[PDB]
Curated annotation (Swiss-Prot), chains A, B, C, D:
It comes from Gloydius halys (Chinese water mocassin). The keyword ATP-binding does not apply. This is Basic phospholipase A2 B. It catalyses: a 1,2-diacyl-sn-glycero-3-phosphocholine + H2O = a 1-acyl-sn-glycero-3-phosphocholine + a fatty acid + H(+). Ca(2+) binds at residues 27, 29, 31, 48.
């Protein structure tokens, strides 16, 4: 679920996801188009590619089980699909954390009309 | 150029493109996500696939030359790229015209958050 | 803080504020222009007028103290400014609740370009 | 009309208005909030104040008549209202031209949530 993803980003980043990542660049918002603006935007591009590979369940609205075993997110459960989407999220949150240093405010709330016409492939 | 595309849609549809198509469904707005809501939305999905195939120029901001020879849009010029994008637009405008009968007001200004998580491939 | 405001709207409305109100009409989004589209949009117009009257602090990013004493939001604290902005929020959330019946989906994510040219005065 | 305004900015600035000014700062986008970010943003703030003074017609969607007599935009017509809005536009385009030197890319597509809470008065 996006609300679980949100909690992962918050803890690993220290920022309010809805304000800082929900509309960042060209891929963090809903969908995605053109070429990723930067490192953080690439995180969203990859996460987008991740959700598309998920077939058995709904990555957006399906709840998955996870824990913070030793400061790190650990995805569990017997459902390989929901765990699959949990890993997509875990990887994205860590991706945001690693590239926090290159985070540009000019990119949050970035207008999609300004995104390149040719989109990068997963 | 989107402003030329707009003139094609207006003449072939009789509607103000900025109001009636700029935010229609899941693909007519900027970018696109999930599954096309309907016929008209499919027009935008295809047009989106069209602009992605264009490599040599900018489909969004590059001006191309065309004429209305015999009530039909005719794309000209020596530039194969700009003409290529002109055909993308010409096809979309005609696509809107043919499916005008299935146009649903409930779909203009459609919230992207409600679009499917798995997007259709070109 | 907007994140506290968001919690008020959620509890009083039952809807995710970021999806259902962050882009509603002509005033709920950032800023505001033209004439309020409907009742819900008027809630935002008034809330906008409320934040403009606040002088001593930052209504958007300043945290205020409040409680849910008896199913109703109660604003506290010794700071008259922060409490002032808490009341702006409290009033807006209740405003959304009372007009939930007239909430129109066609208005969430409403394009600002379509908003009237002459804006109503506070 | 905004489409005429757009042609003025293009000729006087050499930039695509929809990309470079439609989302610049805190006032160039639709509506406006807080304090102008810079000189260019002030152009939009003033233009905003200009459109609000117009009463007899629609500055956004009403067409006015003008010409480029001697490299300079000249507003004509017998309609004082439409001419009134033509001057608002003419002044803004010139304003953009004069401050092109201070144009900051970090400000195009600027997130309105980051705009000051107290808006400047016309
Ligand atoms: C009125 C309800 C407010 C709930 C909190 C919403 C927080 C997100 O707010 C949104 O941020 C976007 C970019 O970040 C902007 O483009 C939108 O104008 C703004 O509404
Ligand atoms: C589609 C036409 C866009 C023309 C470029 C406009 C440059 C920014 O111009 C702004 O446009 C707003 C709407 O976005 C208007 O409400 C404002 O009057 C104006 O400041």
């Amino acid at each position: 679920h996006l609300l679980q993803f949100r909690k992962m980003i918050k803890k690993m980043t220290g920022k309010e996801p809805v304000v800082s990542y929900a509309f960042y660049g060209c891929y963090c918002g809903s969908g995605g188009r053109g070429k990723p603006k930067d490192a953080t935007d690439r995180c969203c591009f990859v996460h987008d590619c991740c959700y598309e590979k998920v077939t058995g369940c709904d990555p957006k609205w399906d709840d998955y089980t996870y824990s913070w075993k030793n400061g790190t997110i650990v995805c569990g459960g017997d459902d390989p699909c929901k765990k699959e989407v949990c890993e997509c999220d875990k990887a994205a949150a860590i991706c945001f954390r690693d590239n926090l240093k290159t985070y540009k405010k000019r990119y949050m709330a970035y207008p999609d009309i300004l995104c390149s016409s040719k989109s990068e492939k997963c």
